[PDB]
Symmetry: C5
Subunit: 341 residues, 5 copies
């Protein structure tokens, strides 16, 4: 009760920040087109990024660490002022230091921070490339199935097989994104009895891969054609592997706890070394330093698991859009080439 | 009317800058040859880059942010001068600070700026490599079709198939470049009825891939030869995938808004920390700092979507030039090897 | 006895640190799920990393080098104080220097330290990717064996072959991790006579690869199917090769001894150059500098051989979990596709 | 005449520098062997690099920009001296400034310069790897042709085909190097009528690829063997693609004009900020700064198109040397294996 | 005689350093096991690297450049002392300067040095990966030959073919390492008449590749199996290509002479700029700066050609060890799988 009520009050802003950041990660994202790129590289982008700072998910996550160090600066400033006004006994010293130790270690701090954020950006690029390969693989496999499968007796199996290659990116998205309804997202993509088996499996992408591999065995193909055709599933297994490792295995905790601890120690004694040249300007100085330096580390932490920063619904809808345009256009391209003669 | 007329006047230079930069991105680009490389690595390149600065697209895009911070410096300088001349009441302080907080965070700013521009350059290299692979793939596929297809009954289909492999890089260019007339750029490359189906499809590169895949099924080939031959389409699907992701998915907005916000905050208080050592020299100092530092970020923003910085018309014309030289030379190489005996 | 007892006392803290770090490398690690990622990117992560510092394996390994340089600072401070109080003869000078040589070489030290840790992180990413490829390869091979092998006469051999593809990641983990009981970890995965041959071989992963390759020769397959099927073993040979080279071949000893020697020389004379601006504050300054800078190098040394920082038991159990879900679901997917007709 | 004669005199040193650098790019280069590596890592390498500075191609290209900024420093110094001696009217001020703006932007300049040179080095490594792949591909293709082709009726065609695989790296070198006589370099490698068709083609590497592909169609091979054999031409198409893109597409002109303009602005006002601490030492200081900083950018510009920095004649002669050693040794290896029995 | 005897005395320490470094590159290296990794990441590694500094090959190579700059500092200090004591005429000035030009260029020097050493480390990683691929390729090829070749009539040829795949890594090691006895290292690996042909060839790795390719043509295999089997030689051609290019083509001499010349100019005038703050402490300051900064460049120069820093004998013996364990275990795995039934 006496000390428990103090911790509960201090546990309000960080709880609000955690709720705000996590709700901001469920936001729907969209593929950039040309007119959105024009808006991106505009003269007003510097004004509009500054005025949208208070609604930014990254800025609102800095509120706990920036407030924490600003009160540390205010307490150091208050104590140093009390010593300067002789309001405390002579035994109490003035908390001041030379900036020279910090001038020797500043480049070490900057290189650690920016390299940690570069490691996070590398894992985002790995995610983006893996999804590029899965979507190009599904497009390539669907294109080849539309051309390869010809027999009138395999029409139902060909239709089923084209439904699973569209459904695989959706299942993989529902595997990598938290709180995703695969049943709703596959309702119009798989058959009612088709989807029941998929919903009953622990590994939904793997299960759909299994339906793909068994359809290729029941098709009436020459063995060379089937071997060529079942070589395209390895793309899906590779995609599952890369996507599961970015979720399972983060950047080593030693490497990221180093950046965390360095930044916390640097802002704890930053008002002490800055006292001689700044006096009460250590409060705004520590506020701006903590906001700037913790923002780099915050950006690194948010993109370290990158699948929520990708337009995976639009990437998945692109494969579905491509197979319809193709099955509609088949009639026309077939009549056009018949005419060449 | 009273405040609306002020915003309209302030919305003139950024509108002019946005119009100038966007018109400069439609410029026709050309592949470097040897004598253009000699001009590139000349002693006069430092003079000619400086004298062509006022016509540079990047420099004219810096005019809004550089003017904005130069008037901030002029207002801070005017206020500090009024305090120094005792033209304001004693309550009004002098806006001055120590440079020591900025000396600790300078390397963090420099590393963030230069790493952001390096991320943009990485996406340009990804674009350039993808186009390298698509053009080498189209050259390789065309070379193999000229050698593989022999039957006199497949001459029309072979000619048609060589027309689509030339047309695929042009369709992909017209997919990635804004305001591109595919109908005009494919007028002499595809047949009149051939192009109508392509113009009616939502995915023109995909449609041409579909015409390629169906021609390979109607060719009278051995199945091993056809499987070898239809393995070269995967290059085109990979090219489409990489090109669509560089347009759809930019560098995460957190990562680039960080660099934007850092630079805006750094130049807002830069005249305050520089006042003690510079006085009215904060105006030229802030002008040069804003011009130098915003130019790095501007270069990063312009090459982030890189397909307008590539000579995609010359890369596409190279594939067309190669297939003619080949179909002309076929007669000669065939007679030369017949003679070996 | 007189000097041997002094070395034994000085050999206590480093022995304790070496025991603590090595016991901390046998810790069981777990794949991150979604709610563990939420905990990772929390507002409290800066507080909880600081309060868990005294139990951190990296921090307890810094105790020997941080104590060593803190007593060096205390001895330099004591000597300089004795000179300032004229307690020593006039011949004895004051150990002071200018910081200007250190201000010119600080960025060289920071770039060396952070690049060494980046080299270590690159070897961790190489390890993580190699295990990604091995697990995706085993999943892909198992999926294809479940579909490819059909003959009722090859049921026993198919079951045996699926047991070795699950067992290969476990043997490779027991090859790369020290003090690993392969006999206990393969007790329920291979047959009793199957495991005796594996336990008698010097290269257990290689031996299991050999059982896989011989099963593929005894299967009643068409030669094209078998060639397609025995192309998936190359993944396992590549995995063995990459995993053995990260253990056998460290980062060149020149490159890492450079960072070691630089840091030792920099902290030996750091209290001498800092004396004029700090006086007795060289003790806390050297303590914090040694703790910060040796922590970067320590993080680099711990992840340089990275296989203990990976959840290799969970990655291995995922392949076993996937093949059961598959052999259970086979009955259902077969009845579902039979029904398409 | 009055102003034209001044520009002609100022256009002498840059013309001489451009002539010297361009003649130095036609120099014959040689593959390092072991005793040249011993000379490379010698104790005297620091003395011999300094004494060979005046004959260095990079140093003689710095003469125009280093002289230009040294006279700027001399003019600023002369003007500041005239003000200090009161030789000009009181209205004329002293051109001095604080170094603090330059101390905040120094790391930005250094990171831009060194990253630009790293981009140039990346394009050199891309060139070197592409030539590695082409030479290994030609060696691999020649080795397989010597083993695969057996029929006594295909001896003439086999000899012809081995002549084109040796000739392809020479044609690609003559495609990428300026002023290269392909007729002289292929005189002893192709037949007299063979070379006439190659000389008449606009794309000589492509033409030789076409002679290779047509020889493989006229060989009496099984179709599986021919498909295996014509899969090795893709290496040559990839080599042509990568080599043409490094010549056609430089590093984006925005990115390199940034480094150019930054360096020119930094050395223009460098004597003004250095006046208070240096006085006439701004002339040697600006001379050394311009020589050091423009040398980094110069190195970047010279290796940006890297094919003249490679020993392409020695790499091409290695493939020719390997096929002779092989066709000579064939008799011996055939008799050795016949004897195994 | 008068000036020749002075150069001979100055040519003693660099000759001794060159002899010591070159003898230290022939040292036998060993693959790290687990207990050597424990020794690597110990608390005593900072003490044991410092006490083994005088026997370090890199440190003894710094003796010529560190002594050279320390006498430069001593001469500058002696001259400045003579001026301060008025022992020279008034015309002779005091060699002093401001450190501000060096404070602006320090980060440029540090980034150049550390990036040059990173380029050297990249070439070491390329070498290490190439050897990883060659050893995994030889293991994979040997494993497949043991399974694929079955005919009792091909036992002698199968034994011969397994002897050449073990011998290829040894020949490639004897190709890349200077002063290597291939005759002694292949004495127990090839037949007496087998080795005579290999010793008579100019390209020993190529010759062994030729014996491998001819054995595959004389084996009684199905053509699909042989094509699968002769696809594994491309690994050996790739290995030869990458290994020959790292020896033939160093890092461009412009790029490394830049770092050399920068470091020599920086330490020549370093005692002049440090005189005002250090006086005779420029001698130890220049000694430590030259030792630290030239050590980074020295590490870069020693690993630039990396094949002596690899345990190539242990990597080669691992392939030989693996094929014996396999040919011994064949009997057992064959009886085990026969029993499954």
């Amino acid at each position: 009760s006496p000390v428990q009520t103090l911790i509960s009050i201090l546990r309000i802003i960080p709880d609000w920040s955690d709720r705000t950041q996590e709700r901001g990660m469920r936001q729907h994202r969209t593929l950039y087109d040309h007119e959105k790129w024009m808006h991106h590289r505009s003269s007003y982008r510097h004004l509009r990024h500054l005025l949208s700072s208070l609604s930014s998910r990254v800025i609102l996550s800095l509120i706990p660490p920036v407030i924490a160090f600003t009160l540390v600066a205010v307490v150091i400033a208050s104590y140093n002022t009390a010593v300067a006004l002789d309001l405390l006994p002579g035994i109490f010293p003035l908390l001041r230091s030379s900036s020279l130790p910090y001038q020797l270690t500043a480049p070490a701090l900057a290189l650690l921070l920016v390299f940690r954020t570069e490691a996070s950006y590398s894992r985002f690029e790995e995610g983006r490339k893996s999804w590029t390969e899965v979507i190009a693989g599904a497009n390539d496999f669907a294109r080849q199935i539309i051309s390869s499968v010809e027999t009138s007796g395999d029409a139902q199996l060909k239709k089923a097989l084209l439904q699973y290659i569209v459904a695989f990116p959706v299942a993989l998205k529902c595997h990598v994104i938290y709180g995703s309804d695969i049943a709703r997202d596959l309702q119009n993509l798989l058959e009612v009895d088709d989807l029941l088996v998929v919903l009953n499996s622990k590994h939904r992408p793997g299960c759909i891969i299994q339906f793909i591999s068994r359809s290729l065995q029941l098709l009436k193909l020459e063995e060379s054609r089937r071997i060529m055709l079942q070589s395209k599933i390895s793309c899906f297994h590779e995609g599952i592997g890369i996507c599961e490792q970015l979720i399972g295995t983060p950047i080593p905790l030693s490497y990221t706890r180093l950046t965390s601890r360095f930044l916390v120690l640097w802002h704890l004694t930053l008002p002490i070394i800055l006292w001689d040249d700044c006096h009460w300007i250590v409060v705004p100085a520590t506020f701006i330093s903590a906001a700037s330096l913790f923002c780099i580390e915050q950006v690194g932490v948010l993109i370290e698991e990158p699948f929520p920063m990708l337009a995976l619904d639009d990437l998945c809808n692109s494969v579905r859009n491509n197979v319809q345009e193709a099955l509609a256009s088949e009639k026309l391209i077939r009549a056009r080439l018949a005419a060449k003669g």
